[PDB]
Amino acid sequence: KEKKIRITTNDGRQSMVTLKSSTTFFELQESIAREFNIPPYLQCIRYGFPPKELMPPQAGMEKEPVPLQHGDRITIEILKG
Numbered sequence: 001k002e003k004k005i006r007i008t009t010n011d012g013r014q015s016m017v018t019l020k021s022s023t024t025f026f027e028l029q030e031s032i033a034r035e036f037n038i039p040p041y042l043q044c045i046r047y048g049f050p051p052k053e054l055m056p057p058q059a060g061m062e063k064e065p066v067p068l069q070h071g072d073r074i075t076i077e078i079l080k081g
Contacts, residue, residue, distance in 0.1 A: 003070030007032055009043075010077045021065060025056045028066045032076050044077035051075050 002021055008014035015035035019028060029040035036043070045054040047068055054074075057064055068074060 003068075003072075005068050005070070006073040007035055007045075008073070008075045009036055009038065010075065019066060019068065022063075023065050024062055025054060025066060026062060028054075028068075029056075036076065038076065038078050039081075042079040042081050044079055046075040046077065047072065 002018050002023070004016060005019045006014060006016050009032075013036060015032075017031045017035050019031055023031070025045075026040070028045060029043055032038065032043045032045065033040050046052055047054055054067065
C-alpha cells in the first residue's frame with residue numbers, strides 16, 4: 001500500500017510509478033530506473049514549478065522519504081555519465 005506518482009524525462013518520455021511512502025531519494029531513483037532506461041546515477045528528478053533539482057540526502061536524511069506524494073508529478077533528466 002503505497003502512493004502513485006508520474007515521471008517525465010527531458011528526452012521526451014514519461015511513466016507512472018508506485019513510489020513507497022518511506023521512499024527516499026535513493027528508493028525513488030531506483031523506481032525511475034525501472035519505468036525508464038536510465039540508471040540511478042543518470043536520473044535527475046525535478047518537482048514543483050519551476051522544476052527543482054531534488055538533491056540526494058545524507059547520513060540521517062537518507063531514511064527520509066521523497067518530497068512527492070500520491071498524485072504528484074516529477075521530471076527526470078538524463079545526466080552525462
